């Protein structure tokens, strides 16, 4: 997270850290969406250009964390995975379209002060909240700058950018399964997700029922926090039908 601040304890209790078993290292962010399901970006699990193709046995999720590096005994919960599901139309070859995956935990987790699920939007929530200029929040233990790492979870609030401005910002082909966020060059505020924040949640708080909803997944960017450039997020609501059918069939 570039130009963010330390998270308050418990401010993102759905934040998950994807963690490699051997070597032991951070791989990506993710989110807790129920007692047994974690949501992340497909490119965190499957990315052929880097010979990345993780199986359930390669990975752990860590939930309830604040420190990036400490083992937070009796606070964090470390879970193995039963199964990984990647969107069947995930497009790694061109633009990361449908950059979404689900991971099912071996056993359901108990919630705690530090561990609790985020909501997924429905039609009504997406329509109300997904508009240019409305701010959401991104969290993660990624790089503090493009070219370094935080001791504790970082947080930054970023505004949604209008779809034409997102498109003009890049020569990569943008689809309706993506949205972008970040401040304009004139706006006197900056901030972005960066390497290691990928897969993590972009969330917004409903003014109607005080609940947090995950509207996006940190997906991709050209650099981190560059003027005229914007972060891209997977559009969760657009892909919600796939999410629902995986959980209904395999849950």
């Amino acid at each position: 997270i570039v130009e963010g601040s330390d998270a308050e304890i418990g401010m993102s209790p759905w934040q998950v850290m994807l963690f490699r078993k051997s070597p032991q290292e951070l791989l990506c962010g993710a989110s807790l969406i129920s007692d047994r399901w974690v949501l992340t970006a497909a490119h965190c699990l499957l990315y052929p250009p880097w010979d990345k193709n993780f199986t359930e046995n390669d990975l752990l999720v860590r939930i309830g964390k604040h420190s990036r590096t400490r083992y937070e005994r009796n606070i964090e919960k470390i879970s193995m995975l039963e199964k990984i599901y990647i969107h069947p139309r995930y497009n790694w070859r061109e633009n990361l379209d449908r950059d979404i995956a689900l991971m099912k935990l071996k056993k359901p987790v108990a919630f705690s002060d530090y561990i609790h699920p985020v909501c997924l939007p429905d039609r009504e929530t997406a329509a109300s909240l997904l508009q240019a200029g409305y701010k959401g929040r991104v969290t993660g233990w990624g790089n503090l700058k493009e070219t370094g790492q935080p001791s504790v979870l970082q947080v930054v609030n970023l505004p949604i950018v209008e779809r034409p401005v997102c498109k003009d910002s890049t020569r990569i082909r943008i689809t309706d399964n993506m949205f972008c966020a970040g401040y304009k060059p004139d706006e006197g505020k900056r901030g972005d997700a960066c390497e290691g924040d990928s897969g993590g949640p972009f969330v917004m708080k409903s003014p109607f029922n005080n609940r947090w909803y995950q509207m996006g997944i940190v997906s991709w960017g050209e650099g981190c926090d560059r003027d005229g450039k914007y972060g891209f997020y997977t559009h969760v609501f657009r892909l919600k039908k796939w999410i629902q059918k995986v959980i209904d069939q395999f849950g």
Binding site: M11, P13, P117, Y134, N157, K205, S206, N210, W212
Partner: peptide, 27 residues
Amino acid sequence: ADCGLRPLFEKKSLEDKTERELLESYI
């Protein structure tokens, strides 16, 4: 049931330090 309500914040009627920036953007 109570997805999206944080045990240390909304469940205790406590706001985090920057939440109001988000809500202010929705006006």
